[PDB]
Amino acid sequence: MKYMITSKGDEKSDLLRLNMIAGFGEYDMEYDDVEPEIVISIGGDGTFLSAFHQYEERLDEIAFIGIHTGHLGFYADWRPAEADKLVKLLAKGEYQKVSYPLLKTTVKYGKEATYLALNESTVKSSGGPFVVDVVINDIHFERFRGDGLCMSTPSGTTAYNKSLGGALMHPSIEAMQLTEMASINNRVYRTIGSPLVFPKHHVVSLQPVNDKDFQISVDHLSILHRDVQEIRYEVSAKKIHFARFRSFPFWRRVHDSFIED
Amino acid sequence: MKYMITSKGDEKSDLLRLNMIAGFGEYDMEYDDVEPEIVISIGGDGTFLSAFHQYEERLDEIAFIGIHTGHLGFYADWRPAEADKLVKLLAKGEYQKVSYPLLKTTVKYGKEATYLALNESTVKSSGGPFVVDVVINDIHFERFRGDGLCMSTPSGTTAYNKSLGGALMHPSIEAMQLTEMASINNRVYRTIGSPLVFPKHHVVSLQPVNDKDFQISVDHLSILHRDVQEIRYEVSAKKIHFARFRSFPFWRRVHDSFIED
Amino acid sequence: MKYMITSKGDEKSDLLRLNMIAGFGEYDMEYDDVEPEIVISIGGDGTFLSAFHQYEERLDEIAFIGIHTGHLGFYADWRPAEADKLVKLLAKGEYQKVSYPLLKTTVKYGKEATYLALNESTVKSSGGPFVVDVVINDIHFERFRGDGLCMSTPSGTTAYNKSLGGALMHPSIEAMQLTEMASINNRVYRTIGSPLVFPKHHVVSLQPVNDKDFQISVDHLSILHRDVQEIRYEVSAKKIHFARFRSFPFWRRVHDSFIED
Amino acid sequence: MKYMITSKGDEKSDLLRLNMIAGFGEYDMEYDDVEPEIVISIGGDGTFLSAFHQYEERLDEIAFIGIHTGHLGFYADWRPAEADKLVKLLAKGEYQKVSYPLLKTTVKYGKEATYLALNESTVKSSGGPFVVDVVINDIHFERFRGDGLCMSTPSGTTAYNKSLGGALMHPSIEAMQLTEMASINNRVYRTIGSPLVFPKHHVVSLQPVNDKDFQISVDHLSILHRDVQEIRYEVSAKKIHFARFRSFPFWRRVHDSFIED
Numbered sequence A, B, C, D: 001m002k003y004m005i006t007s008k009g010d011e012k013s014d015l016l017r018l019n020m021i022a023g024f025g026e027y028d029m030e031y032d033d034v035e036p037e038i039v040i041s042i043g044g045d046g047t048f049l050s051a052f053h054q055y056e057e058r059l060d061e062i063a064f065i066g067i068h069t070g071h072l073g074f075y076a077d078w079r080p081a082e083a084d085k086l087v088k089l090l091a092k093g094e095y096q097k098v099s100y101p102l103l104k105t106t107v108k109y110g111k112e113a114t115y116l117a118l119n120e121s122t123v124k125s126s127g128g129p130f131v132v133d134v135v136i137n138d139i140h141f142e143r144f145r146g147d148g149l150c151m152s153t154p155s156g157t158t159a160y161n162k163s164l165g166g167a168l169m170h171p172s173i174e175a176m177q178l179t180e181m182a183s184i185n186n187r188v189y190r191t192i193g194s195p196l197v198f199p200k201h202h203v204v205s206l207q208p209v210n211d212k213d214f215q216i217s218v219d220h221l222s223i224l225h226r227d228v229q230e231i232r233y234e235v236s237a238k239k240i241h242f243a244r245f246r247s248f249p250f251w252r253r254v255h256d257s258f259i260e261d
C-alpha cells in the first residue's frame, strides 16, 4: 500500500532509503508521505521518535518499522543488510501488528494543550527551585522538591526512566511510571523516593507551589511553558502499531541492548 | 456466616479478639476456624501474613480483614477503636470484595514443590557465592552473581522490594517484579541492574551454575532447599480477596505509611 | 573586634540583627562590613552561603557564625533564643576556630576564571546533550553522557551531593567527591556509576566533546559559560574558619538534620 | 632476601610458581615461608586476601605482590607473561613501597577478639531480623533495621562496598566507609541511607537491641558469633605495604577493572 521513508540524513541512511525506494518500485507499493500506511525510519531511535511525532495524528492507520544504521536502536530493530528482505516481506504483507501503550500529557493555563509521548514526559523548573504538589486521583500525595520528575511509557522505561533508577516493564502492561530527579529528603522535606507505576485510568496531576514557569519535555522536544496551572498525566487511549515480521521479544531486545549483542 | 479471628498473642490483641467474639455472639455469626468465610487478623502485617498462609487452600472462599494493634500495618487497615463498627458492618454484610494478585513459586529437584506468596519470594546462597542463570520465557537473559534475588507481588512492592530499590505498583496490575540484592558488575560480570516487571503468563526461571543448595524464602518462612534443579516464578491464577467497608485507596495507604499519617 | 551581620531580610531576621547590634554596642565590638573579623549570618543556609561569598577574599581573616531563624540550617548552628548568650561569649572571645576544606573550580576559555565553593560545583549542558571526557591527573578515565556532574566539598556532601547518592564525609578529611546525574549506560556507553572521592592535590579535568557551552553553578550561582575549553576541579588550599563556642559534632549535626531533632 | 609464593592451586598457577622459584634460585633469594620479607600471590584477589591473612602478624616486615592468572584482580596487578621481569627486578630490589590503610574490628562478649580486614567487615543476623543501634564516638546516631551493614577500607571500596552503592575512595585517604544493606524506611523506622565516610580515630560501635547472635565476616571468612555485646570499627594503626616496580595509578586500576581494559 502507501508507504514513506524518513532518513537520519547522513550519506549512509539516504542511500539506503534510495535503494529501498527503488526496490519498492517493483511492487504495488506507492510512495506517499501525506497519508502513508507504512512508515519506515532509517537512522537511530531519535529518527524513529521524529517519525512517530510527524504522524501522531494517524496512529490508528500506520504501522511503524525501524532500521538502525549505527548503534542498535531500541525501536529500530532491523539491520541495513536485511533491508532487501524487508522490502520483500513488506511488499507481500501478511505481517502481524504489535501495539505499545502511550502517555497523554495535558497542560492547563489561565486554556489547554495535550501531547503524546512514546518514551516519556518530564518537568523541570525554569531556573529557580522546582517545587510541585503531586495529586493522585484528586488526593494530595506529596510535595516534591528536587530537580524534576519523569513520567514514562512501558517502552520508555529503557530510556531516561532507566537512568533515574526506574524499573523496566514489558509493553503489554498498560501503565505509566513516575521517577524522581534528585529529590531532597530531610526532617522537613519528604518524598516517596521509589518509582511509582500507575494503571490505566489513574490521573497524576502536578500543581505549582510558587513559580508557575516550567520546562516541559515530550520525548525529544523541550519547551518552556509560562503561566502553567496544572500538568496532567494518564495512559493514553491511543496506541502505536509496529509491523513485526518475526519474533523479536522485548526481553531479548533488552538483553541485546544492555547485557551484550 | 462463618468467621475466625487470629491474634498476635499479646494481651492487647487477645482481649480485642475476645471482645469481638462476644460482639459477634449477638448476630447470626458462627465461629469456625476450619472452614471460615471471614478471617480477621489482629496484630501487624506478620500476623496477617500468617493468617493468609494458614488458609491458603481456601483463598477462593475467604475474604480477609486486618486490624493493626500497633504500628500501622499495610494489610491491616483497621484501628482497634473501630472494632465495634467492624463487627456491626461485618455482621450485616453487603460489603464489597477486592482482589490482589499473588506469586507462584515452583521448586524442582532430582520432584516438585509449589508455594504461594503474598509479599514476595527470595533466593540466596546456602553459604558460598550465589551464582544463577536467569531464563525468561526459555531465553537466557543474564548470569546473576550477588547476594540474591527477590520476586514481589504488587502489594509486596512496598515491603522487601521497596528496600531494594524496586518500584511501587498498584495492585490492579497483574504483574510480578524482580529486584537484585547487591550484584557485582565489572568488565567480566554483567547484570541488568534495573528492576524488571513481568506480566501474567511470563515465566522466570532460575538455574544453578555451581552450587545446588539455596535458602528460599516465601514471605516470612525461610527454608534451605537441597539438590535444587530450578526455581520458577509466575503470576498465580489465584487471588486473595479483602472485605472492604469503605474507600481506602492504595496510594493513600502508601501515603499514610511512608509520607506521614 | 570588628564584626558584621547579614540578614535574610524578613521581619524576623532584621529585628534579631538589630537586637544583636544593640547588644554588641555594650562592648568593645565595632561594626564594620568592609573588613570584619567576625561575620554573623541570620536566616538559613542560603543566607550563610551568601555571607561566605561576600567575603571570600578575606577567608583567612574571618570566622563565620550562623543563626537559623527557620528550618535548622546545616551551617547556621544557633537558635534565635540563644542570641544573647552568643553576643556575650563572642564579646568576651576566647572561642575555638574550626576549619573546613573548600573546592577550587577553574574554567578555561579561548583566558581563565577561578571560583571557590563551600557546598559544590556542578556542570550541565546549555540545552542539547551533555557529553564530557573525564581526565584524572592527565589520564582519560571515562566519557560521561548524562544530565551533568557534581563536585562536592566534605561539608557539601549533605546537600546536593546527598540527593544524588553520594556519601557523607566528615569535614576533617581534605577531599572532594564527584557524583553523576542520570548517566546513560548500555552496551555502547559506560561510566563508573559510583561516586568518586579524591584526595588533596588530585586534579579532575572535564573536557568538551562536541558542544562547548555549559551551565556551571558554584553553590547558589548558576551562569552559562561560552567557548569553554576545560573545567578543572581540585581541593583548595584555602579553608573557611568557624567560631565554635561548644561541641556540636558533625555526626550529631547530621543526626539532627536527617534522623530527627 | 627471604620470599615465599602462594598459589591458587590450579595447574596454571603452580607451574608459574615453580618457574618463578627456579628463576629465583639464580640470585641471593632464599625461600622462607615462616619469616618472608616478600610474599608473592599467584591467582586472583581471593588468593591475595588469603596471603595477607596468613601473614597479618608481620605486616610491618612484608611487602606484597600479586600476579593474576585469570580475571584481572584488583590487588594482583601483574600478568603471568611478565613474571620473569618480575623475578629480575625483584631480585635486584630498589623498588618503592606503597601503603594502604586497614580496618580494625573488635568484638566484645560476656572477653574480646580483634580482626584486621583488607577489603571490609560485615554484620548480618543469625536468622531472625537484624536490628542494631549505631553509636558514633559514643553518641547514638541511629537504629538500623535491615539485612546488615558493611564497613570498608579505601582499597575495599571497589569490592562489596561498591555493589551496595558506596563511593570509591583513593587509598591515600585514611578512612573507613559504612554502607547499608536493604534498610527499611517508613514513618516509624529511619536510617540515614547514605554511605558514611569516617576519618582516623573515629570509633563506630554497633550494639544489639534484641538478638545477641550475628554472622560477622572479615574479608572472605564468615563466622557466627554468639553472646555478642558490641562490635567496634576503627581505622587500624597498621598498614599493608605493596612492592611497586612502576606507576600503576589507582584510578587507572579502577578504569581497567570497570570501564574497560
Ligand SMILES: NCCS(=O)(=O)NC[C@H]1O[C@@H](n2c(C#CCN(CC(=O)O)C[C@H]3O[C@@H](n4cnc5c(N)ncnc54)[C@H](O)[C@@H]3O)nc3c(N)ncnc32)[C@H](O)[C@@H]1O
Binding pocket: A044, A045, A046, A047, A049, A071, A072, A073, A074, A075, A119, A120, A155, A156, A157, A158, A159, A160, A161, A163, A219, A220, C128, C129, C145, C146, C147, C181, C182, C183, C184
Ligand atoms: N539528549 C539525548 C542524549 S542520549 O544520549 O540520551 N540519546 C538517546 C540514547 O537513548 C537511546 N534510546 C532512546 C532514544 C532516543 C532519542 N533521544 C535523542 C534525540 O531525540 O535525538 C531522546 C531521548 O533521550 C532520552 N534521554 C534524555 N536524557 C537522558 C539521560 N540522562 N539518560 C538516558 N536517556 C536520556 C529520553 O528518553 C529521550 O526520549 N529511546 C530508547 C528506549 N525507549 N529504550 C532504550 N534506549 C533508548 C538511543 O538509542 C540513544 O542511545
Ligand SMILES: NCCS(=O)(=O)NC[C@H]1O[C@@H](n2c(C#CCN(CC(=O)O)C[C@H]3O[C@@H](n4cnc5c(N)ncnc54)[C@H](O)[C@@H]3O)nc3c(N)ncnc32)[C@H](O)[C@@H]1O
Binding pocket: B044, B045, B046, B047, B049, B071, B072, B073, B074, B075, B119, B120, B155, B156, B157, B158, B159, B160, B161, B163, B219, B220, D128, D129, D145, D146, D147, D181, D182, D183, D184
Ligand atoms: N524480617 C522482618 C523484619 S521487618 O522489619 O522487615 N518487619 C516487617 C515490616 O514490614 C512491614 N510490611 C510487611 C510485613 C511483614 C512481616 N514480616 C515479618 C514477619 O513475618 O514476622 C515479613 C516481611 O518482612 C519483609 N522484609 C524482610 N526483610 C526486609 C528488609 N530488609 N527490608 C524491608 N522489608 C523486609 C518481607 O517483605 C517479608 O515478607 N508487609 C508489607 C507490605 N506489603 N507493604 C509495606 N510494609 C509491609 C511490616 O508492617 C513491618 O513494619
Ligand SMILES: NCCS(=O)(=O)NC[C@H]1O[C@@H](n2c(C#CCN(CC(=O)O)C[C@H]3O[C@@H](n4cnc5c(N)ncnc54)[C@H](O)[C@@H]3O)nc3c(N)ncnc32)[C@H](O)[C@@H]1O
Binding pocket: A128, A129, A145, A146, A147, A181, A182, A183, A184, C044, C045, C046, C047, C049, C071, C072, C073, C074, C075, C119, C120, C155, C156, C157, C158, C159, C160, C161, C163, C219, C220
Ligand atoms: N535550589 C535550592 C533549593 S533547595 O531546596 O535545595 N534549598 C537548600 C536546602 O538544602 C539545605 N542545605 C544547604 C543549602 C543551601 C542553599 N541553597 C539555596 C539558596 O542558595 O538559596 C543552595 C544549595 O541547594 C542545594 N541543592 C540544589 N539542588 C538540590 C537538589 N536537587 N537536592 C538537594 N539540594 C539541592 C545545593 O547544595 C546548593 O548549594 N547546604 C546544605 C549542606 N551543606 N548540608 C545540608 N543541607 C544543606 C538548606 O538548609 C535547604 O534546606
Ligand SMILES: NCCS(=O)(=O)NC[C@H]1O[C@@H](n2c(C#CCN(CC(=O)O)C[C@H]3O[C@@H](n4cnc5c(N)ncnc54)[C@H](O)[C@@H]3O)nc3c(N)ncnc32)[C@H](O)[C@@H]1O
Binding pocket: B128, B129, B145, B146, B147, B181, B182, B183, B184, D044, D045, D046, D047, D049, D071, D072, D073, D074, D075, D119, D120, D155, D156, D157, D158, D159, D160, D161, D163, D219, D220
Ligand atoms: N563471595 C565472593 C563472590 S565474588 O563474585 O564477589 N568474588 C570476588 C570478586 O571481587 C573481586 N574483588 C575482590 C575480591 C575477592 C575475593 N572474594 C572471594 C574469595 O575470598 O574467595 C571475597 C570478597 O568478595 C567480595 N564480595 C562478597 N559479596 C559480594 C557482592 N555481593 N558483591 C561484590 N563483591 C562481593 C567482598 O569484598 C569479599 O572481600 N576484592 C576486590 C577489590 N578490593 N576491588 C575490586 N574487586 C575486588 C575479585 O577480583 C572477584 O572478581
